[PDB]
Amino acid sequence: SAVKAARYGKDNVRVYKVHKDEKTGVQTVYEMTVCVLLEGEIETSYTKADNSVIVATDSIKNTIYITAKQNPVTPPELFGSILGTHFIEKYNHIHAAHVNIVCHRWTRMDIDGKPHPHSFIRDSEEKRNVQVDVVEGKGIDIKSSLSGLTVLKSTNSQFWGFLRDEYTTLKETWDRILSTDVDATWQWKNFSGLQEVRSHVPKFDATWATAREVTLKTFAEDNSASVQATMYKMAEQILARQQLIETVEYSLPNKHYFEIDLSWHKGLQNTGKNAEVFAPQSDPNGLIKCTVGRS
Amino acid sequence: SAVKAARYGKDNVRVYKVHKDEKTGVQTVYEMTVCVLLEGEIETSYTKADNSVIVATDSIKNTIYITAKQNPVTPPELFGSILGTHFIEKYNHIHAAHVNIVCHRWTRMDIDGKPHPHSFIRDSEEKRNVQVDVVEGKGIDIKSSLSGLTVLKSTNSQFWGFLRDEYTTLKETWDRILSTDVDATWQWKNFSGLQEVRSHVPKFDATWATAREVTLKTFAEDNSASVQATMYKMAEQILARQQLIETVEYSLPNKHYFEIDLSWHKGLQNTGKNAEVFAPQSDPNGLIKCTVGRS
Amino acid sequence: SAVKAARYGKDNVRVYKVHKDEKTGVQTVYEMTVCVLLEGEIETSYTKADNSVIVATDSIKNTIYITAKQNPVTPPELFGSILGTHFIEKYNHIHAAHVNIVCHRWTRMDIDGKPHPHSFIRDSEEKRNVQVDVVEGKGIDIKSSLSGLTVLKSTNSQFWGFLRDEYTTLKETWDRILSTDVDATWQWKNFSGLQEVRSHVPKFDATWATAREVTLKTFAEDNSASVQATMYKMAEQILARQQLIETVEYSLPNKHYFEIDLSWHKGLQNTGKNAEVFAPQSDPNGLIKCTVGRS
Amino acid sequence: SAVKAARYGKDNVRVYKVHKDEKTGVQTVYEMTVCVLLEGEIETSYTKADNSVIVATDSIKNTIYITAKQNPVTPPELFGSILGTHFIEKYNHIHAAHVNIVCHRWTRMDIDGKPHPHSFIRDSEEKRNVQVDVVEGKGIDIKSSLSGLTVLKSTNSQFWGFLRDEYTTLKETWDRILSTDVDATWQWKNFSGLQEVRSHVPKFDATWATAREVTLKTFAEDNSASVQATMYKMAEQILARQQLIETVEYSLPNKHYFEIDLSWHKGLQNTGKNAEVFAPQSDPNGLIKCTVGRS
Numbered sequence A, B, C, D: 001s002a003v004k005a006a007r008y009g010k011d012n013v014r015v016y017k018v019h020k021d022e023k024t025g026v027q028t029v030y031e032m033t034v035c036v037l038l039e040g041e042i043e044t045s046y047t048k049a050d051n052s053v054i055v056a057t058d059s060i061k062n063t064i065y066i067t068a069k070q071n072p073v074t075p076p077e078l079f080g081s082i083l084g085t086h087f088i089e090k091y092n093h094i095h096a097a098h099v100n101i102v103c104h105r106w107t108r109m110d111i112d113g114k115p116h117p118h119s120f121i122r123d124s125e126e127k128r129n130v131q132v133d134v135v136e137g138k139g140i141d142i143k144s145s146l147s148g149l150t151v152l153k154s155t156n157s158q159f160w161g162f163l164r165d166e167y168t169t170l171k172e173t174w175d176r177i178l179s180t181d182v183d184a185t186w187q188w189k190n191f192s193g194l195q196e197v198r199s200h201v202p203k204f205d206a207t208w209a210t211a212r213e214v215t216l217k218t219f220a221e222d223n224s225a226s227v228q229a230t231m232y233k234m235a236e237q238i239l240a241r242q243q244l245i246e247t248v249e250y251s252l253p254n255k256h257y258f259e260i261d262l263s264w265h266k267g268l269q270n271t272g273k274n275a276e277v278f279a280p281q282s283d284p285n286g287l288i289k290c291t292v293g294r295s
């Protein structure tokens, strides 16, 4: 037998950082969960019980805190790139670092119509994420994403004209509820190293904001022919607005809301045009994915 | 042996309702999870296998949908009271109904600074809840709550002057992070029946909004001496603003963020006045409760 | 305003203890999650910012570890009673301690038909729990429970003869699936203090084992007329076997498995006597409760 | 823009099947959660709103139940292969099916030392899983796994001789707790189609049992030099016992249990050789992965 692939490190490292402006008194907080996995010339730790090649996962944890102390933690694309580069430069035998960051929302509170200097609210479990792969001699690959963005529209969704055969019971519809949890990922062109990542810093927050805005607007405004057709429109627009993105991937559950026939009870009308009360279905759910790239 | 207490019913009934304004085209959605448990002269179903006394839990589920079709579902205090009253009036042998409702957020989307007519976002897992107990000949008892409101302040929290003995290692502090998930419940004076609940309908949404506003403002503005002292201030204000409330209860975790001493690494300073990077602790957590009533 | 009730302490304190037999080499592990909440003359911490009355929750955490070091942690009824008694005896102004313990399963592994001396498996998320309330001058009240015991029987469950009215669609049945997650609690007669709890130590593990055995056997063997009738049989037997128990409470979800009509597809028969494939329903669920005491 | 990749289908389809032996009266239950995603000539549904190419996800759900009715559901490798093959053969334009199955435990109850004919218990949240990829003209690729197997050993784990630099605080140890949740996957050689899968049916359950047995025995018996070294031993043995497996992958968290220094309290000794009470850490955790193949 032989080791075909190996990676190891520390998962679920929770980190909080505060920035304090002495001038204005304003404080800003960042909270993330970080995972770092390393690869390199480490097979002997598996095959020969040779621990001399192991950077302890406890040390990886320490390094995350030290790096957060000495560097900006925003945008997460930059922080992940700094963190990953550290490992491949510091350790001769480590040749790849894989950094995943989940950013948690701490939104400044408005109190009496004024932004509060040091108080924050978690407005939704929506996350902003990054995956950064730093590979010695091959640069830095960054995938940015948003996830956990949950939306619903109560009309202006249709689904008709699908394949009908002996397995089909679904009725065509011209008016239904559409609800989903959005997972959207944009993949950046490969960067040569940290200097190039630094040169593009302003694009990271801007592109996240664009991706979010395009998602919300298209969802709200499209008279949707299917999840497939609407998601494609989203992806097309993001690629049009940021030339440094190579691909956009969406993964979308179709969270079903079923009509409830109440006609058995006193002829009560609650279907089609008369539908008012629905039963949200926890499972099963449709799952629709697509990756859109350039011609 | 004897049956000392019994209740039974249907839990986790998900319900969605849409309201459509024909004039304006504007649609509004409500989504809830409902539980209804009944009590009454039902002991023989347990002791003698006498099912004749059982209103099937499946029928309770049907009744929830039918009631939602025929009545407003907002405010939840009113809907719960209608639903509970139904069971005690319809069935001679049922003498109490216990209705719990969790309301899920569907907030109208703003697209290009305009409220969208039929598109919604789940902004946070914060819930608005009601517990309604309808007891034949004893009226309607309603407890209203908000839960899952997660907040953090990065300064203006202190904790010093506590008891110190041979079990104590905690250092006094004049500047710490304070973060919690707020669970706040206000208990209404007993109502004689549905007519009285109806007469107070406007107070329900208003008092929820007040409770939320008081919680957020007090948290942000109090230079907190402890969770105990700040929570008491919240409760006092709510009781002052709504005379029909008898008690206010808060239950608050103290979600700890620990300093990280980095001085072992190149004398790096990250404690006290120099603290920038902290480690959020998933567990254990403080838990502080209090019920405040009138003198 | 006035403080009507208050309690505070530390939740989610994870504790592991190992016992090592020097003679045999055999090791035994215990893992629990502990919550301790205190009550007493502490209102001034809420109303006057007087922290002098507060035993810090951090100190409560320390006390849990110290108590675990110096005392047996099994049975949990005894450990909870020791822990609770400590607080009311040590602090003059603390008059009640409320201790909740969840015990996690670590079952010794059998390797080649032999019990292994120091290796363990988590066989199911079933828990054994205790709630101990120690109240100065009123003794020790203990509620013991098992929870998270998930079972299913594929036949020998019936449900017919229930109330049928204009809200009813449920068909009577003489053969259905019955599945539940068992939550069962037995409440001990009040104990005068720690000496009395100590005198009954052997009864605690024995009664837990009896409660578990009675639950499983009755579930498997009863040709069940309803969840109500079967649960009552369980409770009756437990009360018959342990005279020091005052009440037994069961809380049981009815986790539904629905038939799937496939006759639309090539006349395929999958209902009634021909039912083979079913759809487990995540929600809603029936919820049936009962408390059984002595005549 | 262009569609670079697309797949869609139904997730979280819960399925239960019962087998009834008329001769013996013995009943056996199977419960699974199934996901099916399709690929093929479907880009026009995304780009042109052409639904004619879409097999509705609702129809995929129906097909899962119909297939379960007409075929054995065990071993899951066979059921997944039947299900996947169905889609690529039935629909000309569908060229790949991806089937994921999670099997839930329903273990027959022993009552008074006898196996009960129709009563079952969920003994642990451990799962047996399959991923089956059926690709037109390229055969059937099957990955089998077990997951959620949670174990702990209280001694006979060491970790010393790792890299020490200015980022390292971890002390070397010759005696520690080791606990993990095992995720192990074995990848079968590619099969030409359903006939070949059928020919190997007995190997599927046998290899699952071997993988489980090897995992448990090696964990219990290895005087572990690291998670890396012990996991490699597991993988090596599985590859030695089943020639039709090409690779074995393990992914293992290192769930830390920390010593608690209690010496501040009355010189209490609870570290090193005197360690009895430990603090389980919820996060962070080490994460160690490896894929082992043949020389």
Ligand SMILES: O=c1[nH]c(=O)c2nn[nH]c2[nH]1
Pocket: A008, A054, A055, A056, A057, A058, D159, D170, D225, D226, D227, D228, D254, D286
């Ligand atoms: O078994 C271990 N492997 C590792 O890589 C490691 N790093 N810290 N502790 C550890 N334990």
Ligand SMILES: O=c1[nH]c(=O)c2nn[nH]c2[nH]1
Pocket: B008, B054, B055, B056, B057, B058, C159, C170, C225, C226, C227, C228, C254, C286
């Ligand atoms: O056992 C049952 N008890 C009930 O009360 C009930 N209601 N519907 N199905 C039921 N099954």
Ligand SMILES: O=c1[nH]c(=O)c2nn[nH]c2[nH]1
Pocket: B159, B170, B225, B226, B227, B228, B254, B286, C008, C054, C055, C056, C057, C058
């Ligand atoms: O606000 C607090 N209240 C308390 O009771 C406490 N105990 N430790 N830290 C604390 N913080």
Ligand SMILES: O=c1[nH]c(=O)c2nn[nH]c2[nH]1
Pocket: A159, A170, A225, A226, A227, A228, A254, A286, D008, D054, D055, D056, D057, D058
């Ligand atoms: O938008 C949809 N896309 C689909 O593929 C589908 N299948 N059923 N319902 C559906 N809705």
Ligand code: NA
Pocket: A087, A088, A089, A090, A091, A092, A093, A094, A095, A136
């Ligand atoms: Na390197």
Ligand code: NA
Pocket: B087, B088, B089, B090, B091, B092, B093, B094, B095, B136
């Ligand atoms: Na009545």
Ligand code: NA
Pocket: C087, C088, C089, C090, C091, C092, C093, C094, C095, C136
């Ligand atoms: Na006392």
Ligand code: NA
Pocket: D087, D088, D089, D090, D091, D092, D093, D094, D095, D136
């Ligand atoms: Na095909």
Ligand SMILES: [Xe]
Pocket: A015, A016, A017, A030, A031, A032, A068, A073
């Ligand atoms: Xe951070």
Ligand SMILES: [Xe]
Pocket: A180, A219, A227, A230, A231, A252
């Ligand atoms: Xe969508």
Ligand SMILES: [Xe]
Pocket: B015, B016, B017, B030, B031, B032, B068, B073
């Ligand atoms: Xe609703």
Ligand SMILES: [Xe]
Pocket: B180, B219, B227, B230, B231, B252
């Ligand atoms: Xe607070």
Ligand SMILES: [Xe]
Pocket: C015, C016, C017, C030, C031, C032, C068, C073
């Ligand atoms: Xe313990």
Ligand SMILES: [Xe]
Pocket: C180, C219, C227, C230, C231, C252
């Ligand atoms: Xe039951």
Ligand SMILES: [Xe]
Pocket: D015, D016, D017, D030, D031, D032, D068, D073
């Ligand atoms: Xe199944």
Ligand SMILES: [Xe]
Pocket: D180, D219, D227, D230, D231, D252
């Ligand atoms: Xe391991």
